[PDB]
Amino acid sequence: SGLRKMAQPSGVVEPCIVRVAYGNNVLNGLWLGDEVICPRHVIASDTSRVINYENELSSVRLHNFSIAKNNAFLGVVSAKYKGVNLVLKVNQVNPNTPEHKFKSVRPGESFNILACYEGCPGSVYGVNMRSQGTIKGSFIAGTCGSVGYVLENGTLYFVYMHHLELGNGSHVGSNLEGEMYGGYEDQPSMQLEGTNVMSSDNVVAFLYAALINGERWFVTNTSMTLESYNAWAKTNSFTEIVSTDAFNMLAAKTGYSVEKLLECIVRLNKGFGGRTILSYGSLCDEFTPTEVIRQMYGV
Amino acid sequence: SGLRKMAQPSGVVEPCIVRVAYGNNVLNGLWLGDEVICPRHVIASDTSRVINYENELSSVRLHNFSIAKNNAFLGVVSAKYKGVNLVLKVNQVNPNTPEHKFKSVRPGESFNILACYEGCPGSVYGVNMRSQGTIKGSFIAGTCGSVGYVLENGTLYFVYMHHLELGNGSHVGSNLEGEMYGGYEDQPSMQLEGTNVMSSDNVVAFLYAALINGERWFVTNTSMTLESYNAWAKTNSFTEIVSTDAFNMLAAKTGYSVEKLLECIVRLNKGFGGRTILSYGSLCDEFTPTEVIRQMYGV
Amino acid sequence: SGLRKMAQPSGVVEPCIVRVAYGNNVLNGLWLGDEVICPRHVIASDTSRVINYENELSSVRLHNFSIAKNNAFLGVVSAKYKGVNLVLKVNQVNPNTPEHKFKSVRPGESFNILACYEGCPGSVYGVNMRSQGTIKGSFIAGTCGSVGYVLENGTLYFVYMHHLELGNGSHVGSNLEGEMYGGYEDQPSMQLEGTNVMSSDNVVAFLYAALINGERWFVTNTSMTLESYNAWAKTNSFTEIVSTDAFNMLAAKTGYSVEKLLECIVRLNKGFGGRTILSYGSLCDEFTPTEVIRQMYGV
Amino acid sequence: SGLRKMAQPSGVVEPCIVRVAYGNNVLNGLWLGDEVICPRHVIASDTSRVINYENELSSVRLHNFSIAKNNAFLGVVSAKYKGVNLVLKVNQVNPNTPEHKFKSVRPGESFNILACYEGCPGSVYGVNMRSQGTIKGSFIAGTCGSVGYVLENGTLYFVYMHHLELGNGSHVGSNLEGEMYGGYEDQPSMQLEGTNVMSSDNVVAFLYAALINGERWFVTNTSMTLESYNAWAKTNSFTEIVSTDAFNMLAAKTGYSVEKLLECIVRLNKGFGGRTILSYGSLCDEFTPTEVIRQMYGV
């Protein structure tokens, strides 16, 4: 038993992390085949003031890049912007390039952060994409270019590269195709996060996890239909739920229907009344149905 | 968020994980050089009742082991006990044996779990050793033999191997010397954990993280001497603090002395009075000064 | 019943295949009117090293060309490039030139390969163009200049000519206007493919085919709106579906709405849980709605 | 009976329309919650020359915004781009904000325009998206920021905001994520539409509608195979027809197969020779088959 925010193993990703230096900036890049992807602000002379990315790119000389894996240096032969990412061609093919794909993550979807410092992987932890396109990712200075990945269906996906922290502390990155999540821009300017919508599927998953791990005080003799829940959700900042199908396994193993947990959400959203569920004092949407099933019953 | 539990990258450990089966038992082993270490209860014919490990070893048949590292099957040359672990001489040297050391973690110290499921690494997360020798993880059937490690100087230390779950849900394992943390026996018998002694160092770190995070409601300018606090701790199931020097960074930084925070601990131990600290409803001792320092600042 | 990746019949295409040799190089050409078209790398002295195609063309000697076909007598009169294709004017019109057009295939579209080995038609099989402009076929040494075609609306279209295989093993060719699909270079250099977007239309067709052939385990009667589905698709490297109109016959015949299949896709993309669908282990996008319809209902 | 181009009722949208004036520009905004969304060219010094939107936004004066609904003046507090849309944060939340989603419409699809004139909703009418991502509406100076919407599943979707007219008179707007349909840019530069490809599906429905109204002078006893037509279609800037859709509802209730109508399209494409069909003197592709079915029969 037990519920913890976990990350999938980082082994296959670690050999792809390199140190990218330009000028007085140092951050992290992703080395796959003969190219390195990194945040394009590594070439910005002053990341604390407004950045003219056109001018910065004209100013670039390839020989000013320093790219290193451990301390074997990789020479850059070509550089281009792709969206908010720099794509740098190097002569050396990463001999440990894993089989992989690029995709993005949706609100509610969980993924793994390999947080890196100046080319050195330092920690790994699970996060969850929020509706405004931000994560709570505990990034600090020196961690830009840190990589988010998912393992799903035996496929390694790269889904995130870290760029910046908003004023409210939320974290903003791009996918590996240079599109910033949330449409935020890679500028030190004031950018507002906005209305965060709770992932309903995840909250249902949380309550199932609660049931499996011993906690049951919140369930009553009431259940509400999926439609009625989706009506409620659309005006209380919760996602609609498409299908109960995702939880079948969880309903079967616990004997609790999705419709009962839906009613629980409506109630519990108004407070826990002092009590806690799995130590949390409020509903938590950071765990997907998949994460819960994995953790409770094996991959 | 603010303060989140992290793990260190698992890449160097993953190639050491093997699937070990004997009879109806399947768990994980640690493959280092030409040996595999795993919980000796893998050869227990019935893990639901008391086990005579002398007899079990006596009647072991070496060809009844199945040991596998993905692509590779290993043959067992000899079996012996080291404490509560089996040490199995195998016919093949692990080509990916990393540079490693062994140590035991002490109460209050954090480490990483590579949760493995019948030979396959599935997840990575951080835990903290409690005074009674237990951790609060998330282990299910199939995860015995899962490995705990720290990346330190800057080498790899193996510190934990998973064996069992107590009636109260706490998790129990051994060091790689075969000594069960907390002295629990590897038997399916009732075993009491005993009273948890909170790590004062970690709780001070917790409160610094809260202050760093802008939460001030619990502090006064009133302080408490290190000697005074330790007097209290001794009869309130909190560790005594040796010295204050480990917090100098956080102290100088927040402008709050350790002594002030000691005052907070004695007061907050009587209850949070319906407020929270970093979304917690009571004092948390799972984050070390190191963790808080690192997770907030320049490595 | 049954589902098989098929090829339209190759008879009309077979008389158009000729052997083109130059120096030690031997491959295939398409003979139409008074022109033979083939991959330009036939005139490269060493295809295992990078090629200067301007130098190679500058020093072509027309009498070094060898064109052969069992029922013809052909001399090269002239040569020039069109993109990556060599276009040879010959001194004889193909008497068996069929009515034909050139067109390019788009991502998701299926076509036929006539695989030829040094001028000799050897096999024929169906393929599907992926979003990165590659196909998964089966080409070896001697098969360059193998021709792709579609019979579409009573019309013969030539759509492909084979040039090379990427490091990852995907197959690359040009249209008959000499434009390489996916913009790859006809160089023995290292070139990366990137991530293929799955055709949602094809995946939907494939599930319909599965249903018709008695596969039912994956389907439930919960449906997902086109809108919801497309939001998911946009981030999961699937194409968005424009109208369900192309499925109306399949939906009528099976009694299953597209919306019910859209829900299946979101589920099944996470994995089959170890199960199969028509012997496949993951979702398949190589079958178009057209391919499925004429195969299941002959129209 | 009878066939008119219809709009869905506009009541749910009308309370969201506000007047947005900045400097010398006056257009319409969409007030949802605490945001007013409008075309970003409202803050351009000079809409008659190339515009530097980075600078215009850089130098934007939030107090020179005059936003009025009711006669209530909203105060701007924050401006940003979201693609080609300006998103303004305002000082009062729209109490009449309806429940809504955003989606994009695709070529061939029908949707609703609420034409607004410098802040006042003035008319509502149906449009259909053309192949190049344009519509033929009726927009003049003062109508920018007019809104397109669809009602589906009782759900309100915002799908269009009006930006400009092309040189040829075709109308161009964005979705509410600020992506301009047809990839046009919000510049007073020359921009070519591309050649318009009529939707064959929509023309069939139109002809079916005509038959139902008792107009049949244009239909003969002869037919055209689906493959003959599609061949004709590529040549004559018409889209290819996929299956027969369940034109079967129409086919059955009219007696005429699709194939008969395809022959009509080819004949009628030349011109109607003085006569008309439902008042038109040329083929109309603005009605979808679904649209026609509901309009005539109700579903």
Task: Describe, in short, the structure shown.
With 299 residues, chain A is α+β, with helices and mostly antiparallel strands. Chain A has 3 domains: 14-97, Thrombin, subunit H (Beta Barrel), CATH 2.40.10.10; 98-185, Trypsin-like serine proteases (Thrombin, subunit H, Beta Barrel); 197-299, main proteinase (3clpro) structure, domain 3.
Structure commentary:
The structure holds 4 chains of a larger assembly. The first copy, chain A, is built from 6 helices and 13 strands. Chain A has 3 domains: 14-97, Thrombin, subunit H (Beta Barrel); 98-185, Thrombin, subunit H (Beta Barrel), CATH 2.40.10; 197-299, main proteinase (3clpro) structure, domain 3. In chain A, the strands form 2 sheets. A 7-stranded antiparallel beta sheet of chain A has the order 5-4-1-2-3-7-6, with no helix packed on it. Chain A starts with 16 loop residues before the first strand and ends with a helix. Chain A has helices spanning 53-59, 200-212, 226-233, 248-254, 258-268, 289-297, and strands spanning 17-22, 25-32, 35-39, 65-69, 72-74, 76-82, 85-90, 101-102, 110-117, 120-128, 147-152, 155-165, 171-174. In chain A, strand 12 (155-165) and strand 13 (171-174) form a beta hairpin. The first copy, chain A, is α+β, with helices and mostly antiparallel strands and 299 residues long.
Identify the CATH architecture of the largest domain in chain A: Orthogonal Bundle
Assembly annotation: 4 chains of a larger assembly
Strand segment tally of chain A: 13
CATH fold-level assignment of the largest domain in chain A: main proteinase (3clpro) structure, domain 3
Question: How many separate helices of chain A?
Answer: 6
The level-1 CATH class of the largest domain in chain A: Mainly Alpha
Q: SSE order of chain A in H/E notation?
A: EEEHEEEEEEEEEEHHHHH
| Spatial sequence of strands, sheet with the most strands of chain A | 5-4-1-2-3-7-6
Strand content of chain A: 25-35%
What is the 3D form of chain A? elongated
PDB class: hydrolase/hydrolase inhibitor
Keywords: Coronavirus, main protease, 3CLpro, Mpro, fipv, FCoV, inhibitor complex, feline infectious peritonitis, Hydrolase-Hydrolase Inhibitor complex
Entry title: 2.1 A X-Ray Structure of FIPV-3CLpro bound to covalent inhibitor
Chains A, B, C, D: 3C-like proteinase
